[PDB]
Amino acid sequence: PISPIETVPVKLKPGMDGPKVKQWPLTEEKIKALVEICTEMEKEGKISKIGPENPYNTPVFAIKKKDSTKWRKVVDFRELNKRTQDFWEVQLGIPHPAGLKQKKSVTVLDVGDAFYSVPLDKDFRKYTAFTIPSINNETPGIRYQYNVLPMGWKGSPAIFQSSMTKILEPFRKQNPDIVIYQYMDDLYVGSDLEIGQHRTKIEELRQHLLRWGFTTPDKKHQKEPPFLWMGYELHPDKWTVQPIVLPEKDSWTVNDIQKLVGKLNWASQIYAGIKVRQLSKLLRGTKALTEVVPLTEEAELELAENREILKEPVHGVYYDPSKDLIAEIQKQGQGQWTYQIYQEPFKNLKTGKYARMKGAHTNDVKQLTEAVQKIATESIVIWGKTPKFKLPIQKETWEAWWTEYWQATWIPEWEFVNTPPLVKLWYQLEKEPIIGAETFYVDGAANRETKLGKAGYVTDRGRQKVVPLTDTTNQKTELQAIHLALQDSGLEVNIVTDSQYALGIIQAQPDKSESELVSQIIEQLIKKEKVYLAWVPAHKGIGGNEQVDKLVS
Amino acid sequence: IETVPVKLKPGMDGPKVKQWPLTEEKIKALVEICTEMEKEGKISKIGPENPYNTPVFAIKKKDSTKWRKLVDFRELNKRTQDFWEVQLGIPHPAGLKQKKSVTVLDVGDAYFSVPLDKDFRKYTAFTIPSINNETPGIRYQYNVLPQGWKGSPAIFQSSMTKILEPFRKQNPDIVIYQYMDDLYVGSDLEIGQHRTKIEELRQHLLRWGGYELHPDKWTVQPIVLPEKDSWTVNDIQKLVGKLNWASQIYAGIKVRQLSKLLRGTKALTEVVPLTEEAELELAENREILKEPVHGVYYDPSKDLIAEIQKQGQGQWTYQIYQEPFKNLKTGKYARMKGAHTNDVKQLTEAVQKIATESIVIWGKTPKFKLPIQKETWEAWWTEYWQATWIPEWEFVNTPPLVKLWY
DNA sequence: TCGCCCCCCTTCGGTGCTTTGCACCGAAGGGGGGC
Ligand SMILES: Nc1nc2c(ncn2[C@H]2C[C@H](O)[C@@H](COP(=O)(O)OP(=O)(O)OP(=O)(O)O)O2)c(=O)[nH]1
Ligand SMILES: [Mg+2]
């Protein structure tokens, strides 16, 4: 059936015309698959025969459906899509089973031939012209246009979703205590009514849908747990992901590793402690998806750990609005973080992970804050509120950070949880100079034209050094001058630089960095006992600074 | 009524900005506000064939604990034609900053009685999200002058003058200035007498359709130099680097006879006696910092910029300028909620206060340079926003070299 | 040989700075998952 709902008016982008691209050859099995779909689509009014007055064309093909017997007709509208107006997409995100509440009666329904039940704007139909080949040359193919939403057109999903929202709105308004999760044409319907009254409401919803042209075939009509929904299995008390099968290969290509990492990220939503840093590093610097990449030892270990996690059964629970949300985070090493969101202990709603490297230089406290922010955003999306946090960072560590760090920062209500390794600052810089400690005046300079440079220092105890540097930069020289002062000094030091750049990096107390030079400076800062670091402007003849500025010349 | 023809600036398209996630209580407030607005025909439900979008959220001032819908039309305003070109703009009275008390009124509802150009309505679309994406977003567009749109005070202006003429005739000494959805209304009356005539202005409005500021206490915080009895090498290179930086703002500031009082490669903790020729240079520069800079004047043709530095213990310094190092105003913001522990709330409140001062003083808000990570700001700032306008901002990570402003 | 959505990890290129590389950030490549 075709919905009597009003068509949505759609336009081509200004100055553009329609697509004119020839059909390609296809197999006999797919030609008769399409002839069966097409001649029956014409009898249902989904398409109409067109002639030469219509100059447009676009190629069509067919792919299999998860129910193996059925075929899906699909059109390669890439050209028409480019020329079609933009849309504002109404699908804002993906519903998650951890956001569902427990319901006494649950149904899952699916609309049959959903896109084909929504009419297409009449003035637009001529641009959907296509041709079914039929063994390619015994005949010039038969030509049709769509009267309904085609699969493969850029506008079809949003127009369907918007139309489905309009059709459902009268039923939702009349039935506020029935939850209808609406994802494309898939409808999850939960209620606290007894099964008898629930089925009454379902028949009423199905009849309402049918009067608007939306069938709900019995094949796609689930009434008994477990419900198959959005890639999950819904039980009354719990939910699971549908089985995740990891690729198992003797030789791995780039593309295989890419699929493995993706499967693992998907699993990380309910399997705690998944890691993908070492497998992901294997993708860096590769140049072809078919390039063979040997697994490093670290990636094999990571893979083996993930496989042990994946063999154990897991389940999520459903959301209880009357209880707090709690998010707990653990540090895993090398900028990797894993978390669990629960309301009652040892009953996770869902899990996840955070492992992005943001910025060239950072520290664990910053990354913990990023994890907190990711979890906060995800909880707003799924539950509409943020959770209480349990974090492996002492309250004094945090307070030391947000007072000596010059940017505003914050973490919401959180509780310390002692799950080592704890998040900590790996060194602090003295607010005042240190009595009895050596004073280094450092400087470096490089020649931008010749990439040759020099780094060195002078000292109040009369110590001076100068090192030549090849293939450097202006900024690298200054980092090197600090490198050497830390290298040649005792446990307590006072350092004076004229590099705002270098001071800026070190003052933020980074504990890791994409640069090996900064990495080395960090290791030396961590080994020191006290370090005061001070700045003065360059090329103004200031005592100590001017002397080392002269020496590096 | 007949609508005013409105256009975007040449070569520009409408806003296309994604809706961000909303808490449950903001979504429910929006659903009830928008449903009611739709019944009254101020907005219409639209579909995805309108390709434009602007984020929507909601705020709740607590000493008026009902929700206020806030659409972030900052993008649409940047792309909307100027009404200065159409000569429909509002002028700013120079007397408002002279008043001792200024009350802010939200008059955004007056716009809803004027229809919007039918060809412009599509640019005002917004989308209400859905908890756990239970549904697709629900889309609306305005049929009337929207709150927060640059064009609404301009189109409504002559109507606003007719509404206010009887009140400012009866009160020639009170100054009222419209900025977007707000009226800034200043007077010199006793605090309870000021509030009484605010309530009279409110009810002359209710017949057609905040807290007290004080311009009188917005102290300017100058660059200060430390006062000690004895001075280390470190104290003096911290003082010289600070003055060398101030030499870009002030005129005739020298460090030559303090520069090389640090002569030689000396220890940072070594006490250096001040020469008579350094005490001479120090107090001279100290005065030059006591009196304001000569030659800095506001230019209404240019945007205002605001910088903020976090100083600690709830203290926040700020400068407002249009050209680098020519500060029209320097200041210091301090707050004590009593919780004592939210940097993002403090910065968000500092931004509203500074922006409010620019409205009172110059009639527009500055573009803020915010000392915060973009993602930290965006995780939380709407939880603390209480104004009906939103200023422009960007994010900067500038480590302090000098502590110039403290 | 198709479409729309969210997620993560890598790569690339535009922007602005009182720069000469550098750090930041958005977009596009790959992958997962949904219909
Ligand atoms: N262009 C395109 N659209 C798809 C695809 N898969 C699903 N959709 C869209 C179009 C479908 O009509 C809609 C619902 O997906 P279904 O698998 O339920 O297919 P449909 O309802 O049309 O047929 P059905 O009777 O349920 O087997 O979602 C796809 O692979 N390509
Ligand atoms: Mg279907």
Residue numbers in the entry:
A (entry chain A): 1 to 553
B (entry chain B): 5 to 213, 231 to 427
Question: Would you copy out the relevant sentences from the publication that reported this structure?
Answer:
The structure of the N-sites of HIV-1 RT and HBV Pol are considered to be quite similar, as the amino acid sequences that form the N-sites (referred to as motifs A, B, C, D, and E) are moderately conserved in both. In our previous studies, we examined various combinations of amino acid substitutions in motifs A–E and found that the HBV-RT-associated 3MB mutant comprising Q151M in motif B and Y115F/F116Y in motif A is useful as a surrogate for structurally studying HBV RT since HIV-1 harboring RT3MB turned out to be highly sensitive against typical anti-HBV NAs, ETV, and 3TC. E-CFCP is a 4′-modified and fluoromethylenated NA that exhibits potent antiviral activity against both wild-type and drug-resistant HBVs but less potent against human immunodeficiency virus type-1 (HIV-1). The present study aimed to elucidate the mechanism of potent antiviral activity of E-CFCP against wild-type and drug-resistant HBV using HIV-1 with HBV-associated mutations in RT.
We also determined the structures of HIV-1 RT4M complexed with DNA:ETV-TP/dGTP at 2.32 and 2.30 Å resolutions, respectively, as reference models for comparison. In contrast, the bound ETV-TP/dGTP are well ordered and superimposed with each other with an RMSD of 0.2–0.3 Å, and their average B-values were similar to those of polypeptide chains and DNA (~ 60 Å2), suggesting that the bound ETV-TP/dGTP is rather static within the N-site. Due to the concavity formed by the Met184 sidechain, the hydrophobic pocket is expanded toward the side of Met184; the interatomic distances between Met184 CG and Ala114 CB are 8.0–8.8 Å and 6.0–6.5 Å in the E-CFCP-TP and dNTP complexes, respectively. Superimposition of the bound E-CFCP-TP, ETV-TP, and dGTP in HIV-1 RT3MB/4M highlights the deviated binding of the cyclopentyl moiety of E-CFCP-TP; the cyclopentyl moiety is shifted approximately 0.6 Å toward Met151 and skewed by approximately 10°. We anticipated that comparing the structures of RT3MB and RT4M would help us understand the structural impact of L74V on the N-site, enabling us to predict the compatibility of E-CFCP-TP binding to the HBV RT N-site.
